[PDB]
Amino acid sequence: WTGQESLSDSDPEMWELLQREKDRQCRGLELIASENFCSRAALEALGSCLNNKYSEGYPGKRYYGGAEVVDEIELLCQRRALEAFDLDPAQWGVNVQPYSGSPANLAVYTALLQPHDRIMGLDLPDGGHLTHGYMSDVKRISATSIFFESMPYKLNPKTGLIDYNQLALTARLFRPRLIIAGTSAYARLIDYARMREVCDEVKAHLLADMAHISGLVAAKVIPSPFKHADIVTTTTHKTLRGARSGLIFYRKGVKAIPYTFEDRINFAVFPSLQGGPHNHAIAAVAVALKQACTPMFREYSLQVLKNARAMADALLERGYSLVSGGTDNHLVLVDLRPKGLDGARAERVLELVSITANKNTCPGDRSAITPGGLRLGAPALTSRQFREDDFRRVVDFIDEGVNIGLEVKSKTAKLQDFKSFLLKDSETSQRLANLRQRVEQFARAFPMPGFDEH
Amino acid sequence: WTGQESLSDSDPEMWELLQREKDRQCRGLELIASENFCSRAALEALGSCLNNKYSEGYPGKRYYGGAEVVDEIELLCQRRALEAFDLDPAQWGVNVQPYSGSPANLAVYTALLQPHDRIMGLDLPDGGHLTHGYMSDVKRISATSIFFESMPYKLNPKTGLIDYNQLALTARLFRPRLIIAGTSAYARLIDYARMREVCDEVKAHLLADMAHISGLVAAKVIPSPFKHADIVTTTTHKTLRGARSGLIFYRKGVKIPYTFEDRINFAVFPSLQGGPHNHAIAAVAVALKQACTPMFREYSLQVLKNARAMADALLERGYSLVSGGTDNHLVLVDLRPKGLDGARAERVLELVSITANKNTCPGDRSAITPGGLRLGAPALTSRQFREDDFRRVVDFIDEGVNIGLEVKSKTAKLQDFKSFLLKDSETSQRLANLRQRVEQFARAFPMPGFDEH
Ligand SMILES: Nc1nc(=O)c2c([nH]1)NC[C@H](CCc1ccc(C(=O)N[C@@H](CCC(=O)O)C(=O)O)cc1)C2
Ligand SMILES: Nc1nc(=O)c2c([nH]1)NC[C@H](CCc1ccc(C(=O)N[C@@H](CCC(=O)O)C(=O)O)cc1)C2
Ligand SMILES: *Cc1c(COP(=O)(O)O)cnc(C)c1O
Ligand SMILES: *Cc1c(COP(=O)(O)O)cnc(C)c1O
Ligand code: NA
């Protein structure tokens, strides 16, 4: 035993699973707006000897030796990150160690706040992330709500936009120390100027969490949160198209009397929260950030925008209703209540024909436990060189699933009744097997980033 | 642009840095006891298309579709985890999503404790981990000590062992809800049974954090904390030799029922983490299948012999070992009797391609410069080192120490020592000579992983 044997030779059971997953990614229409396909280049860094190095601490400030190379990788990754978002090294630092996006948010809260200090974020069912503070009527759900005190802000249910007026009204009363501008399920741009005004008045930190839209911001195809935000967190996957990791950007240098974010942020990441960095992820992130700086990527991102509105316009023209009426970014929120269906039903139909989308609770939902809609994203299929006509055809395939769903709803009662009918009625099975086969044939023909076979 | 281009073609700056790190690993004597060299098979899973799949939730209970294969991988990882540590699925379950060891511990704490509830772990300078709670005189350092209330327990400096008697005395007073049995820098076997007695008495959960020893435990070459703990955390790297990632094992079934399963799983997701890193989960599954083999038992036996051999060789050269020796994968050297400290020895050794880390000696305070050195066998044993090779590692260390002594007699401060090693041309030649001999020696041995990166 050397540990140089191949995966295919040494663990055939696992190799076959990697192949089935690769095949599933190739044959499918991936419409989850968080999802993307990482480059082979970055996957080579991720699957490297960099996994073997413990480098607790920071460049030049390590707790032990042998980190000279790993130091250059970290410092390179930082510079590439600041470059990717057109940030001045004098006015912005960045931490590249967070293990994912959720750790990155937790680290900011523990860096800047005391336990039980107050946080405001977009409510989860209005399109906020778990890590922005989310608790239910029964219990505290996100650890953000356990260790800190979160009150959500909300959508104006008329417009489907962020009710910025209520946020200002309500932040005056709640007195948050930190307010979060960022979304998991929101088709429009965030008014970061208006967020900073609220934050300036109530004397809160503004945290922009651009996870979903970080690629679009780097490419400069939407306006940048960095103009108005103190702190920016993000994933390195999603629209940045990297390996799974996280980043924390923070302002540094002179405020008005210096900013004091850098030392607090870095300390919270290590030694407070994390152990050894995942230097392999850091390197794959650096690879992906270089790719993000190129004109290729600006074109990718522009196509992401165009593909999204092509999907929107297409859905409007098949008569579907959209939350907020459309999109200014990489996704579309489809309200299926005005079509006489819901998200739960649509999802399971779409799934069975290799179309993968996300449920979305919409403003107009009459039932709190059945989501009304669906999030549909461009980035993943755009990375497979999809264009407007290809997304029109995606929308076309979706419409068939919806229409099966509508037909199965009137021949069923409950939601578990719905899902069993999809499996056991031969006439429904066959129409599903047919649509699936046509979807997989359509999808397979497009190129796919990464390795050929895993 | 396809995203199918190779790394060497598309990003030569990064590919050159990967190649330097690979050469550094190949030419060095890696003695950091938490280090190991991950198999190629596992790294192929790590750098894979499994990076591309969001699968928030758990097998059969995901928040969205497309997870048929990812469910199978996660479920397979769980089966192999329970297999590696010889656990009955009726009595034990396992969560495979923690992003690393430190996340695994925070998730256990948020599952079982309220904010500000009480925790006890081995003090950091006595050999515990940051995540077991750590505060200086001046401030709270570990998040474990911010969100929870940490009080450490200590070694008996007389024996270098954990003072189980003072733990029992002091836990009766402090009333911890959770006590941690596990170490970063400790050469001996933990008396888990005694930890369990103290826990039962004060009505506290016993957590074994076995990160350093997990592979030894898997191979059944040391006693298993699973006989006595309710919860067991571990890294998947270190002695398990997998990708960086974490595990939380927990009791289930009866004694009426255990309530860890749902609380642990919920703490991991949705409370703390987001989407799991399925690529790491697959790498971990690969390393766990390796961990069940007779090969791995032979490896883990060898790690013990190699550490023994390193200890005996150090003793025969007149070095002091904290606790007198070792029953595990590492040895703790006390260099004060020799006239040198850990900070000096660490830096000399680093320059001759031997990586170790400094270690506070029992009875000293963090403020005094650490008197010792932590030396581990797992990494080099993965490169097929045997007992004679570790004797030879100790020869090289002895030269390093002997140089450090000469430089100490010619320098005043520590910063003085450190730039005398660089600028004084006679000692830098003596170092360059040793470095080359060390690197020659080390390069001969095989290395797990890919050839060039
Ligand atoms: N906008 C948005 N942000 C997000 O972070 C996520 C999404 N959507 N969608 C998918 C996933 C879901 C997160 C998530 C998990 C649990 C509960 C929850 O309410 N759990 C309670 C009560 C459930 C019930 O009423 O039956 C529980 O204790 O089980 C809510 C949301 C993550
Ligand atoms: N046994 C053990 N467990 C561990 O988890 C680690 C080790 N050793 N060794 C390396 C690293 C050590 C982490 C670590 C971090 C901060 C301080 C600390 O005391 N910080 C104070 C004052 C220190 C000083 O005066 O230099 C501060 O400045 O906030 C100590 C140790 C991780
Ligand atoms: C997806 C996301 C995150 C982080 O998710 P991880 O799975 O932890 O990487 C954080 N914030 C927002 C707004 C997100 O959409
Ligand atoms: C190394 C270690 C950890 C943490 O592992 P990371 O992957 O560095 O977060 C936790 N506990 C113990 C006992 C360890 O040795
Ligand atoms: Na590329």
From Swiss-Prot, chain B:
Disulfide bonds, paired cysteine numbers: none
Residues with the N6-succinyllysine modification: 238
UniProt cross-references to InterPro entries, sorted A to Z: PyrdxlP-dep_Trfase, PyrdxlP-dep_Trfase_major, PyrdxlP-dep_Trfase_small, Ser_HO-MeTrfase, Ser_HO-MeTrfase-like, Ser_HO-MeTrfase_PLP_BS, SHMT-like_dom
GO MF entry, a single one: L-allo-threonine aldolase activity
Extra information: In eukaryotes there are two forms of the enzymes: a cytosolic one and a mitochondrial one.
PANTHER family tied to this protein: SERINE HYDROXYMETHYLTRANSFERASE, SERINE HYDROXYMETHYLTRANSFERASE, MITOCHONDRIAL
Assembly information from the UniProt record: Homotetramer; in the presence of bound pyridoxal 5'-phosphate. Homodimer; in the absence of bound pyridoxal 5'-phosphate. Pyridoxal 5'-phosphate binding mediates an important conformation change that is required for tetramerization. Interacts with ABRAXAS2; the interaction is direct. Identified in a complex with ABRAXAS2 and the other subunits of the BRISC complex, at least composed of the ABRAXAS2, BRCC3/BRCC36, BABAM2 and BABAM1/NBA1. Identified in a complex with ABRAXAS2 and IFNAR1. Interacts with KIRREL3.
Protein's recorded name: Serine hydroxymethyltransferase, mitochondrial
Organism the protein comes from: Homo sapiens (Human)
Lineage per the UniProt record: Eukaryota, Metazoa, Chordata, Craniata, Vertebrata
